[PDB]
Design a protein around this motif. Structure first.
Motif, PDB file in Angstrom:
ATOM      1  N   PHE A  41       4.236  19.399 -64.385  1.00 17.00           N
ATOM      2  CA  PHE A  41       5.531  19.240 -65.038  1.00 17.00           C
ATOM      3  C   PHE A  41       6.467  20.426 -64.792  1.00 17.00           C
ATOM      4  O   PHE A  41       7.614  20.413 -65.235  1.00 17.00           O
ATOM      5  N   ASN A  42       5.980  21.454 -64.088  1.00 16.22           N
ATOM      6  CA  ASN A  42       6.812  22.621 -63.819  1.00 16.22           C
ATOM      7  C   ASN A  42       8.000  22.271 -62.933  1.00 16.22           C
ATOM      8  O   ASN A  42       9.048  22.923 -63.015  1.00 16.22           O
ATOM      9  N   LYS A  78      16.347  23.745 -64.990  1.00 12.73           N
ATOM     10  CA  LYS A  78      16.928  25.086 -64.997  1.00 12.73           C
ATOM     11  C   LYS A  78      17.999  25.230 -63.923  1.00 12.73           C
ATOM     12  O   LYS A  78      19.026  25.893 -64.134  1.00 12.73           O
ATOM     13  N   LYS A 131      -1.485  32.532 -67.682  1.00 12.06           N
ATOM     14  CA  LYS A 131      -1.783  31.749 -68.871  1.00 12.06           C
ATOM     15  C   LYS A 131      -3.210  31.228 -68.817  1.00 12.06           C
ATOM     16  O   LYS A 131      -3.614  30.609 -67.827  1.00 12.06           O
ATOM     17  N   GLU A 161       4.918  22.533 -72.752  1.00 14.57           N
ATOM     18  CA  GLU A 161       4.255  23.667 -72.125  1.00 14.57           C
ATOM     19  C   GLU A 161       5.020  24.145 -70.898  1.00 14.57           C
ATOM     20  O   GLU A 161       5.222  25.352 -70.713  1.00 14.57           O
ATOM     21  N   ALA A 162       5.467  23.211 -70.055  1.00 14.01           N
ATOM     22  CA  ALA A 162       6.215  23.588 -68.861  1.00 14.01           C
ATOM     23  C   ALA A 162       7.550  24.226 -69.220  1.00 14.01           C
ATOM     24  O   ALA A 162       7.950  25.225 -68.609  1.00 14.01           O
ATOM     25  N   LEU A 163       8.255  23.662 -70.204  1.00 15.44           N
ATOM     26  CA  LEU A 163       9.537  24.230 -70.608  1.00 15.44           C
ATOM     27  C   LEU A 163       9.364  25.635 -71.167  1.00 15.44           C
ATOM     28  O   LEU A 163      10.169  26.529 -70.880  1.00 15.44           O
ATOM     29  N   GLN A 164       8.319  25.852 -71.968  1.00 15.26           N
ATOM     30  CA  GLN A 164       8.092  27.180 -72.529  1.00 15.26           C
ATOM     31  C   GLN A 164       7.706  28.178 -71.445  1.00 15.26           C
ATOM     32  O   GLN A 164       8.108  29.346 -71.500  1.00 15.26           O
ATOM     33  N   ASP A 165       6.929  27.741 -70.453  1.00 16.86           N
ATOM     34  CA  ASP A 165       6.503  28.653 -69.396  1.00 16.86           C
ATOM     35  C   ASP A 165       7.669  29.048 -68.500  1.00 16.86           C
ATOM     36  O   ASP A 165       7.931  30.239 -68.294  1.00 16.86           O
ATOM     37  N   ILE A 166       8.380  28.062 -67.951  1.00 15.33           N
ATOM     38  CA  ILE A 166       9.459  28.366 -67.018  1.00 15.33           C
ATOM     39  C   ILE A 166      10.637  28.996 -67.748  1.00 15.33           C
ATOM     40  O   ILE A 166      11.254  29.947 -67.254  1.00 15.33           O
ATOM     41  N   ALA A 218      10.912  21.288 -65.089  1.00 17.34           N
ATOM     42  CA  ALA A 218      11.514  22.459 -65.715  1.00 17.34           C
ATOM     43  C   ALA A 218      12.372  23.231 -64.723  1.00 17.34           C
ATOM     44  O   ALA A 218      13.472  23.679 -65.061  1.00 17.34           O
ATOM     45  N   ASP A 230       7.271  31.722 -60.939  1.00 16.53           N
ATOM     46  CA  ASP A 230       8.325  32.137 -61.857  1.00 16.53           C
ATOM     47  C   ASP A 230       7.896  32.054 -63.317  1.00 16.53           C
ATOM     48  O   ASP A 230       8.746  32.143 -64.208  1.00 16.53           O
ATOM     49  N   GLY A 231       6.602  31.887 -63.583  1.00 19.40           N
ATOM     50  CA  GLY A 231       6.145  31.745 -64.947  1.00 19.40           C
ATOM     51  C   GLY A 231       6.273  33.030 -65.740  1.00 19.40           C
ATOM     52  O   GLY A 231       6.389  34.130 -65.199  1.00 19.40           O
ATOM     53  N   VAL A 232       6.253  32.872 -67.064  1.00 21.20           N
ATOM     54  CA  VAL A 232       6.389  34.021 -67.954  1.00 21.20           C
ATOM     55  C   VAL A 232       5.196  34.955 -67.807  1.00 21.20           C
ATOM     56  O   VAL A 232       5.352  36.181 -67.758  1.00 21.20           O
ATOM     57  N   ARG A 255      -2.237  34.605 -73.333  1.00 20.76           N
ATOM     58  CA  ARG A 255      -1.213  35.124 -72.440  1.00 20.76           C
ATOM     59  C   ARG A 255      -1.501  36.590 -72.169  1.00 20.76           C
ATOM     60  O   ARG A 255      -1.931  37.318 -73.068  1.00 20.76           O
TER      61      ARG A 255
END
Lengths: 24, 56, 311, 311, 311, 24, 24
Positions: free
Chosen positions: B1-2, B9, E29, G18-23, B5, E24-26, E88
């Motif tokens: 699902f990335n 964005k 995880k 989950e994807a929205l929070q990560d990206i 997102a 590009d992830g925070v 995290r």
């Protein structure tokens, strides 16, 4: 029995990505 | 699902950039062709000025 | 039935085709899924290949090119050798190529001709939209610019126009399809949805540019209540422009039908005028799916709601 | 159990009802699904019809109007004659009617009274929120304006208020429900979730307006670390306002419980104060579903997290 | 295989672990799901606990700490006593702590060192990115600032760098992984996708700041057509900077492979250089899932597309 | 056997659209 | 027979959030 989840998650991802790319 | 997102964005950045365009103060330089605003391809041949700049 | 590609005929490999379009979509979209054995793998289909789908048209029952575009993306599975395409007509190029143009006061047809002339896009004789647009500076994509000026043309009383590619660019008015097909005969299932979701009963224009144009033009305040909006566009620089913009915004909310047809009317496209029961509606969206049984699904709506939402 | 509509009683047709509300939702939402034979088709339910749902209240076991709103949208299936509604109380009107108002320094209650007086909205005696708001100019929807000034009232130490419609507009404080129901007895399943997702340990105010108000008010920096934010609002034009805004933002992150109840407590609504185990939580969201077995699902959370997120 | 927590070893309770990262992830995880009987309930795992996952590394087959972070959120089910975590690494702290900094002209490494020194973040010897950045004022999160200056460093010809936490902060260049693993041997299934979705063939720079820098640097206009963009950044204040920004944007569109592996290569991480068939690709995303059978799924792509999209 | 996909795609679309309309 | 809908709606919601929070 379990492959329905993978199949329909793929369908959901494809459909939403497809709609966003088309309208956007 | 990335992927969704990331696409969304990109749409965020697109919409924000489009909304911010044509707004706010900007630098410029005067030319014989007309006004030349920084960040614009073409010179503006019709523009307004403050009346205190029209002094002899 | 026939998939020309450059030279070959890959209609002997496709599991199914789905022709889908939206009224505000980027391009007429064809998503053809193929099996990829050694034979199809040899020709090495790449992105940028030119696909032409030919099928027996509904109108005259003669083989006609219903789609003519380019392969925008190929996705290949390896465990199961299923190559899947997502074809697009060449309006997708316009939606990706950004460019900045400064325009004086003029009509949408002249601007579209200027874009095509600048970027060397073939185009048929473009219909005179008539409406005169205010001076603007644009930065978005070429298709974005065309859609913006067409929206500003729908405002100020102009007719609703939509751009479709085909072989050469065409300026397609919405309610000008040749055949007004009747879907009631093949109505597998319909979903009549009504709402006040996007209803606009009043509009308080607050002109950001002078002719101090300000006014209110409430149209059905007594019936649905004063569902009010505020239109604050710089492009409205005139009292008549404000009145026409207000008149091109009133509607009784969302009023669409999610139609499902058991037979694929091949020549339907977004914006076409189609009939269900006695009434007539404009195709907001169409999604053909040419599996072994041809099939079609449609989303249609009234003119007022379409003008309010997409224009 | 009883669905009045204008005149009739369509409780003899509904497959199920789902009363759903969110703390930040547009309106109290009832989504009633019906079968539409000739009998129901005759009365011709249109959008804008007034629905009143009456059911035996949990408190006194007397028939009371638990919902009083308007049908915002009807969707009819034809192959299966199932008419489905999505009812809304009249706060949905306020969320769609845009209007511009300029306000001097005053409280939220006065502004709400002004909106109701201008738009002829009936309202009960509105509670004095007390907090004094800075001068602003608004353009968003009437409900948007009300929510904005209520958020600015939650900031500066004011109590958390929420607007619900009923028959006449009511200013409902969150922790003021009559009965603090205990959900542990009917706890089908609960999901205690804890996080630092929206934790705020520090805040560096940078005033865009003068009384040069600048400061930092870190509250639990030693324990959770300096999870810092920056509040840069023009409405903060005072040192005490900055301190109260900072104090109305600190929290230990998201701390909610996704509660599922086997029995539908009929009178629960968003913002109500409800108990699970010994602790007490505020209803972030409630979703009743009055099928043949009444049922309820709840999402509840602590005051600090709700104030941080929704205010 | 070993889950240290603070003191205990909860590897005797976990149903599965999923190590997932995006380019590009925070943060890196780890989402570990546990059953929560009396034994695990006694220790009372709270958010902020420090989790260290230890497993036999693929490289040397020695137990090595593959993950070292903090529990960011715990969600507990009550009907079924299944406690689920979402761990995290401490870059999540940087993505939540906002702060404003004004910077003169300098490199990204100096800025990262300044951030770490200000916020007391341990860091290894940071690689000299070399590229010199223009003066800017930032307000976003610390990780947001780091990503912004790293993106501006990728522009102007600098190498692609990514920040990962581990025990102490590390500045990880993308194509610098020790072992270039070959995934073809364990290729359960692959999905080669090609497109012109984000293809950039031309770019018309319109400098908002002076050295009047304007130009066009179309690279493959004859082949794919003039897929043009407009880069209008203030940070480009130089002709060479404009040329390098243009050269760091051209690509043949999206070109990725959705790889699925039947064996979990334990040490793979986002940005690593990995081989499929003869070609080499950079890991856009990796999602391990350490169930009873170790497994891995990867999304990899070419350097040009990654630089165009994520930089 | 196959109608589950159509049913639950409809549910996903309805739920997400409903949430966006409510919160928005 | 019916729990598949609840299970996979939960999966869809979790994955997208989950994807929205990560990206994001």
């Amino acid at each position: 029995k379990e492959e329905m989840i993978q199949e329909l998650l793929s369908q959901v991802e494809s459909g939403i990505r497809e709609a966003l790319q088309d309208i956007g | 699902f990335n992927g969704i997102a990331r696409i969304l964005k990109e749409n965020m950045n697109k919409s924000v950039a489009n909304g911010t365009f044509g707004m706010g103060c900007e630098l410029a330089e005067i030319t014989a062709n007309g006004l030349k605003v920084n960040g614009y391809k073409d010179e503006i041949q019709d523009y307004l000025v403050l009346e205190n700049l029209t002094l002899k | 039935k026939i998939i020309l590609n450059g030279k070959y005929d890959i209609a002997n490999f496709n599991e199914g085709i789905t022709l889908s379009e939206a009224i505000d979509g980027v391009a007429y979209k064809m998503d053809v899924s193929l099996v990829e054995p050694k034979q199809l793998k040899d020709i090495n289909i790449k992105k940028g290949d030119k696909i032409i789908l030919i099928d027996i048209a509904y109108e005259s029952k003669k083989e006609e090119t219903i789609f003519d575009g380019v392969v925008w993306e190929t996705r290949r599975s390896e465990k199961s050798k299923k190559l899947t395409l997502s074809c697009r007509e060449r309006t997708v190029y316009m939606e990706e190529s950004e460019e900045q143009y400064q325009f004086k006061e003029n009509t949408a047809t002249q601007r579209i001709e200027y874009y095509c002339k600048q970027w060397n896009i073939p185009y048929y004789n473009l219909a005179n939209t008539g409406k005169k647009l205010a001076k603007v500076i644009h930065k978005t994509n070429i298709l974005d610019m065309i859609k913006k000026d067409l929206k500003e043309t729908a405002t100020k009383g102009g007719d609703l126009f939509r751009v479709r590619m085909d072989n050469k660019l065409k300026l397609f008015k919405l309610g000008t399809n040749a055949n007004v097909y009747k879907l009631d005969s093949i109505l597998e299932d319909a979903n009549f949805t009504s709402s006040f979701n996007d209803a606009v009963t009043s509009v308080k224009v607050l002109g950001k540019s002078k002719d101090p144009i300000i006014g209110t033009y409430k149209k059905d305040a007594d019936k649905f209540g004063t569902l009010q909006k505020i239109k604050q566009d710089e492009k409205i620089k005139n009292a008549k422009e404000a009145k026409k913009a207000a008149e091109a915004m009133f509607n009784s909310g969302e009023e669409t039908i999610s139609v499902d047809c058991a037979v694929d009317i091949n020549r339907i496209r977004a914006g076409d005028k189609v009939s269900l029961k006695s009434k007539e509606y404009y195709v907001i969206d169409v999604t053909h799916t040419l599996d072994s049984r041809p099939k079609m699904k449609l989303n249609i709506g009234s003119l007022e709601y379409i003008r309010r939402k997409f224009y």
